[PDB]
Structures are given as structure tokens and as C-alpha cells.
Design a protein around this nucleic acid. Structure first.
Length: 66
DNA sequence: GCGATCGC
DNA sequence: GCGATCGC
């Protein structure tokens, strides 16, 4: 499958892109929210660390219209 | 500070 | 409403 590896307040997680909910660019980073077993988690990676799948999801988000 | 959110 | 949070 495709997991994104990231750090958040220490906890170095690696979430299934299928659990990613929203993705957006903040500066040169790719930020996102994800389903964290019911809660909404937050993560961000540098673009070089972002697997293509996440960048595909980002491009999809970037094409969204009103 | 940028986006966007959570968690308070 | 905003600090923390991520990368930078």
C-alpha cells in the first residue's frame, strides 16, 4: 500500500494514504489531516519526503473548485 | 509566516 | 480565539 512517514510531537508515524483526509501545501511542505482511529490527526512532510501518492492527492486538492 | 487543524 | 504543530 502507500504509507506516508512523518513526525508529530515526537511520534514518528507512518499512515496509509487511504486514511488521509485533506492535503494542502504550506510553504514547501505538504500538510494533511488523516483519520487517526476516530480522531483527526495532523501531519506534514517536506515535498521530497512525500510519496507520489500524497503529491497526487495534493494535486487533486489543488484542482478543487469552489 | 505560510494552511489548516486540533485541542484547549 | 489562539498556541502548537509541521517544514522551512
Amino acid at each position: 500500500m502507500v504509507k506516508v512517514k512523518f513526525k508529530y510531537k515526537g511520534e514518528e508515524k507512518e499512515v496509509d494514504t487511504s486514511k488521509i483526509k485533506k492535503v494542502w501545501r504550506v510553504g514547501k511542505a505538504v500538510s494533511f489531516t488523516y483519520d487517526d482511529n476516530g480522531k483527526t490527526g495532523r501531519g506534514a512532510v517536506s515535498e521530497k519526503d512525500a510519496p507520489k501518492e500524497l503529491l497526487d492527492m495534493l494535486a487533486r486538492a489543488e484542482r478543487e473548485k469552489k
